[PDB]
Chains A and B, each alone.
Chain A
Amino acid sequence: RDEVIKKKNQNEYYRGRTKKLQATIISTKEDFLRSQEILAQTHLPEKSVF
C-alpha cells in the first residue's frame, strides 16, 4: 500500500511536469507566432548585388 501511494505521488508529479511542459510548448507556439510576425516583413536582398 505504501509503494502504491508512492506510485500515485509519482503519477501526479508526472502530471505536474506534464502541465509544466504544456506551458513550455504554449510558450513555444507563441514564439512561433512571433516568428511568423517577423516573417511578415520580407527583407528581400536587393535585385542587383552582383
Chain B
Amino acid sequence: NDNPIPKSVPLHPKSGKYFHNLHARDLSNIYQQCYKQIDETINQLVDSTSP
C-alpha cells in the first residue's frame, strides 16, 4: 500500500547465499581460555594462602 514496500518477500538464491553466510560468532576459544584461567587461579590459590 502507498509506498510499494512489501513487508516481506520469499527467499532468493542470491539472498540464500547471504543466509548461508550468516552465523553466530563463536566464544568456544574465549570460554575455554576463561575456564583454564579460572582453574589455574584456583590451583594457585590452593597453596597460595599462608598456612
Total number of residue pairs linking A and B with CB closer than 8 Å: 7
Interface 9-mer from B5-13, B14-22, B25-33, B40-48: B40-48
Least CB distance from B49 to A in Å reads 11
B interface residues with partner A (beta carbon < 8 Å): 40-41, 44, 48
CB pairs A–B below 8 angstroms (7 shown): A1-B40, A1-B41, A1-B44, A4-B44, A4-B48, A5-B44, A8-B48
Q: Is the interface of A mostly helix, strand, loop or mixed?
A: helix
Least CB distance from A17 to B in Å reads 17
Question: What residue of chain B has the Cβ atom nearest to residue A8's Cβ?
Answer: B48
Question: What residue of chain B has the Cβ atom nearest to residue A1's Cβ?
Answer: B44
